[PDB]
Design a protein around this ligand. Structure first.
Ligand SMILES: CC(=O)N[C@@H]1[C@@H](O)[C@H](O[C@@H]2O[C@H](CO)[C@@H](O[C@@H]3O[C@H](CO[C@H]4O[C@H](CO[C@H]5O[C@H](CO)[C@@H](O)[C@H](O)[C@@H]5O[C@H]5O[C@H](CO)[C@@H](O)[C@H](O)[C@@H]5O)[C@@H](O)[C@H](O)[C@@H]4O)[C@@H](O)[C@H](O[C@H]4O[C@H](CO)[C@@H](O)[C@H](O)[C@@H]4O)[C@@H]3O)[C@H](O)[C@H]2NC(C)=O)[C@@H](CO)O[C@H]1O
Ligand SMILES: CC(=O)N[C@@H]1[C@@H](O)[C@H](O[C@@H]2O[C@H](CO)[C@@H](O[C@@H]3O[C@H](CO[C@H]4O[C@H](CO[C@H]5O[C@H](CO)[C@@H](O)[C@H](O)[C@@H]5O[C@H]5O[C@H](CO)[C@@H](O)[C@H](O)[C@@H]5O)[C@@H](O)[C@H](O)[C@@H]4O)[C@@H](O)[C@H](O[C@H]4O[C@H](CO)[C@@H](O)[C@H](O)[C@@H]4O)[C@@H]3O)[C@H](O)[C@H]2NC(C)=O)[C@@H](CO)O[C@H]1O
Lengths: 453, 126, 101, 128, 43
């Protein structure tokens, strides 16, 4: 009996940390969306009607969301997926032309600059033989003064080429699930006070993640899943100012946004098959794009982050909020899509506070672009067609990407500013619950047993 | 009782050696996205077959629990029976024996073919 | 803020010997970085994450430490090792220790 | 091989601003922050700030805020599109700003943080 | 300034090239090897 023998085990519950290609899952209503619009919903496998996540009792697991792959994988999947969509969509090669632009029909005070330039230009025809002078409307940001005529050009003309998104497509973020292969598990930190790094007591295996819709947005991140108890403020290295802070809200703060102008679209035959969607007459008043949030709730929720922040910087500390320091329009402003057009909302009004140790709304203005250069584009750009009519969207704010000032001097007055830049932060914000592991079922161990002769 | 796939993670190696057919079960069945699906579909059978490969080059195609003829080198663990089967978990246990698992496998490989080369001689004389 | 205090101010040793340099941080728990600056030359990263050697740094440089106490050890001193050495954590720096012949 | 090349030494009068350039090449310029740091005689190193080239987001040392501005320009050469230039402008100079200014970049290994600077420009001496 | 026997293998060529804008053009010059060009046909 004293002599022990190894006996092999198949089906042993043990895993090694891994990386692997996952795959997407979506629901039937995403295909019911039809209209040939949603990206990759079609090639994407379906979800489960009765999903199950088995809780694993008595086990702890060392998570780290700042050294994860499935957010790098996702970030990549999103960039690829998007870029494959633009291949069929028409090229605006000849739209790069010397425009002759003026201001839009308006009677505004001199201080208020003109942001809608009415531009006429020699465009191409269905026939190589001919040409056509035709006019369109452009935002001031989509053009640059070229040089007593007032002539302009599309801003991309010196940086990159341009390709018009098919209107028969949609930008709506629909929920994606990242399902593992066989013999691969995803482990889910069910602890409701986890900062994203270290041992998690409450853990569960699961095939696919939750419905993670790809909202690509700077400053405040929207429509995301929110915390269960406290407003959790997560970072890789909090002490170091170079690293950003991911704030995850507890309560949703609803923010309504809109383009008040009843814009119109005309279609211009580049020919043949090619067809540019110009911006036609503005029906009605010429107003300003903007977003509203409750000053009451913003007060309330900015009070929550401060209560949490003092747990890291001292009880007797001043924590005020300031606007962006300076940089690209991509990062100096709350960027998002709304109805199919891209927004650039001044966040100075939100981040303008001060906090001591112890009924209207916030109108915040916006800009709008059509030729966009997202994901740090370099050789290619994309013209987002005019969306006919009036546009308005309603969304919750789920989080923030804040940034602290490194001047320091041990001052109890370290202030914060909204940030963005790298878009992995957004998927980092939703994927903090998850980790991918490689299943290894072949156990070997001694029990008093010999195999027969 | 039925816990679920991996449910006996933090269970003792004795209790976890009950639910083996559950981890062994959910292990096979369950154009951008299209390629992801394909190199995940092969990865799962490659990874699966590599285990059946081992069980087969040993005598343990049964399988689950399979005894053998290579005796336990105390150097590998040296712990008593109770304190691994009624105490430790496989997550834990794996990291101890991890240093020699491939050396242990080699002992198994020779031992099986040795059985076959022998058993032919038995059926040969009888 | 973090205050890094290096010692000694000057260390006098011969080629072939081993130098030990110290850096005490005012706050514990962070990893340490070290740089070498030979007279009139661009600073050179030696150690990061407390003990990892940077690109092209020979193994006679050895970083270690824990809590608030950190060390740079230079084994079998070479003529080129005589220089000023600085420690760093995030944006904060020690004032340097000079290794002299 | 990563290379950071700065503009030459300059003499500045008090009240002046100095603009220092740092041409960065041998890697994808958008993928790494550039920091600026100054080595001051008898006072040691002082971190000035960082810039992230994608959006040009910046962070300035609290004690220098109001006196420093960092910007960048990305290559416009179609067959050599991945290098760029980082600029730092430092204003309201006094003799106390007499220092050697460096642009620096982190290492690109897995355990390399943001502040261990593996790559250094040759430095720019500014005498006020 | 080479001896007559030695033929010229580096032809300095000027040409109307295209611009970033469809509207315009640009005469610009480049250098080509004799093997990369052919005489087309007192220019
Ligand atoms: C502001 C912002 O930024 N947030 C937006 C947000 O606006 C929006 O979500 C909305 O928010 C608003 C405000 O928070 C909501 O408005 C409030 O809604 C309720 C409306 O009450 C509801 O039901 C009422 C009927 O009352 C009774 O009757 C039922 C049917 O007969 C019956 O089942 C019930 O028992 C019930 O109780 C009794 O009453 C009946 C008679 O009605 C009686 O016979 C029974 O026996 C019972 O005694 C009805 O009144 C109402 O239409 C609604 O269905 C209101 O109480 C609030 O009104 C008060 O405040 C108004 C301004 O705030 C003020 O004008 C009024 O005078 C009132 O004092 C208020 O409207 C809203 O529902 C919700 N809107 C939407 C679209 O869902 C979302 C949307 O995008 O985004 C946020 O970001
Ligand atoms: C500034 C900023 O960035 N912060 C915003 C923030 O503004 C905002 O939250 C708001 O903050 C402001 C300022 O901090 C709040 O304003 C203050 O509110 C109180 C208002 O007092 C309240 O009740 C008053 C009535 O007084 C009495 O009467 C009751 C009813 O009759 C009774 O129950 C009570 O007993 C009470 O006591 C006695 O008085 C009555 C008569 O009123 C008497 O008969 C009784 O017997 C008692 O003796 C009423 O006055 C008032 O409307 C309110 O309901 C005020 O005192 C403050 O006013 C003073 O300061 C003003 C400027 O600061 C100055 O103009 C005045 O002259 C006063 O000196 C002040 O307004 C505010 O309530 C709150 N606002 C909101 C919307 O909630 C939030 C919102 O987003 O965000 C922050 O970021």
């Amino acid at each position: 009996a004293e002599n022990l023998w190894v006996t092999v085990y198949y089906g042993v519950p043990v895993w090694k940390d891994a990386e692997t290609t996952l795959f997407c899952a979506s629901d039937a209503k995403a295909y019911e969306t039809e209209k040939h619009n949603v990206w990759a919903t079609h090639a994407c496998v379906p979800t489960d009607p009765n999903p199950q996540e088995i809780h694993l009792e008595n086990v702890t697991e060392e998570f780290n969301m700042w050294k994860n792959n499935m957010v790098e994988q996702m970030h990549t999947d999103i960039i690829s997926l998007w870029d494959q969509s633009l291949k069929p969509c028409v090229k605006l090669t000849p739209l790069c032309v010397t425009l002759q632009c003026t201001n839009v029909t308006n009677n505004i005070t001199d201080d208020m600059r003109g942001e809608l330039k009415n531009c006429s230009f020699n465009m191409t025809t269905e026939l190589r033989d001919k040409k056509q002078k035709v006019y369109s409307l452009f935002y001031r940001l989509d053009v640059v003064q070229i040089n007593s005529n007032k002539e302009y050009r599309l801003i991309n003309c010196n940086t990159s080429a341009c390709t018009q998104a098919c209107p028969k497509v949609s930008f709506e973020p629909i929920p994606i699930h990242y399902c593992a292969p066989a013999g691969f598990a995803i482990l889910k930190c069910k602890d409701k006070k986890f900062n994203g790094t270290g041992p998690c007591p409450s853990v569960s295996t699961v095939q696919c993640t939750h419905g993670i819709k790809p909202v690509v947005s700077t400053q405040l991140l929207l429509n995301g899943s929110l915390a269960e108890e406290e407003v959790m403020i997560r970072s890789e290295n909090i002490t170091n100012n170079a690293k950003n802070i991911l704030v995850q809200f507890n309560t949703p703060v609803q923010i309504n946004c809109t383009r008040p102008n009843n814009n119109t679209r005309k279609s211009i035959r580049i020919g043949p098959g090619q067809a540019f969607y110009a911006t036609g007459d503005i029906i009605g008043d010429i107003r300003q794009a903007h977003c509203n949030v409750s000053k009451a709730t913003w007060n309330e929720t900015l009070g929550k982050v401060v209560k949490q922040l003092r747990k890291h910087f001292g009880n007797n500390t001043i924590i005020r909020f300031a606007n962006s320091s300076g940089g690209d329009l991509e990062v100096t402003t709350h960027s998002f899509n709304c109805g199919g057009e891209f927004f650039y909302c001044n966040t100075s009004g939100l981040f303008n506070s001060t906090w001591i140790s112890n009924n209207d709304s916030i109108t915040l203005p916006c800009r709008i672009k059509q030729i966009i250069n997202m994901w740090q584009r370099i050789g290619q750009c994309m013209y987002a067609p005019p969306i006919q009519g009036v546009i308005r969207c309603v969304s919750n704010i789920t989080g923030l990407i804040l940034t602290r000032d490194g001047g320091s001097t041990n001052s109890t007055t370290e202030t914060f500013r909204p940030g963005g830049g790298d878009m992995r932060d957004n998927w980092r914000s939703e994927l903090y619950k998850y980790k991918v592991v490689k299943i290894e079922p072949l156990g070997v161990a001694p029990t008093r047993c010999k195999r027969r002769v | 009782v039925f816990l679920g796939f991996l449910g006996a993670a933090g269970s003792t190696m004795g209790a976890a050696s009950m639910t083996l057919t559950v981890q062994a079960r959910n292990l096979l069945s369950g154009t951008v996205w299209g390629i992801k699906q394909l190199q995940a579909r092969v990865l799962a059978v490659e990874r699966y077959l590599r285990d059946q490969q081992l069980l087969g080059i040993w005598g343990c195609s049964g399988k689950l629990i399979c005894c053998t003829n290579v005796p336990w080198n105390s150097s590998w663990s040296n712990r008593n029976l109770s304190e691994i089967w009624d105490n430790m978990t496989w997550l834990q246990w794996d990291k101890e024996i991890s240093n020699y698992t491939q050396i242990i496998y080699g002992l198994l490989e020779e031992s099986q073919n040795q059985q076959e080369k022998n058993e032919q001689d038995l059926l040969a004389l009888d | 803020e973090i205050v890094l205090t290096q010692s000694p101010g000057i260390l006098s040793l011969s080629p072939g010997e081993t130098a030990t340099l110290f850096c005490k941080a005012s706050q514990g728990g962070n990893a340490m970085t070290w740089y070498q600056k030979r007279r009139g030359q661009v600073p050179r990263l030696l150690i990061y994450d407390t003990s990892r050697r940077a690109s092209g740094v020979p193994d006679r440089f050895v970083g270690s430490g824990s809590g608030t106490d950190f060390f740079l050890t230079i084994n079998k001193l070479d003529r080129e090792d005589f220089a000023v050495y600085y420690c760093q954590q995030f944006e904060f720096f020690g004032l340097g220790s000079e290794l002299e012949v | 091989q990563v290379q950071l090349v700065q503009s030459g030494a300059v003499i500045k009068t008090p009240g002046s601003s100095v603009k220092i350039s740092c041409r960065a090449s041998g890697y994808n310029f958008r993928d790494y922050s550039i920091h600026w740091v100054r080595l001051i005689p008898d006072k040691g190193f002082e971190w000035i700030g960082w810039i992230k080239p994608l959006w040009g987001a910046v962070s300035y040392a609290r004690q220098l805020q109001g006196r420093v501005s960092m910007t960048r320009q990305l290559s416009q050469d179609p067959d050599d599109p991945d290098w760029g230039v980082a600029y730092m402008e430092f204003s309201g100079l006094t003799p106390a700003d007499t220092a050697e200014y460096f642009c620096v970049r982190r290492g690109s290994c897995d355990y390399c943080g943001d502040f261990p600077w593996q790559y250094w420009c040759q430095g720019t001496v500014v005498v006020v």
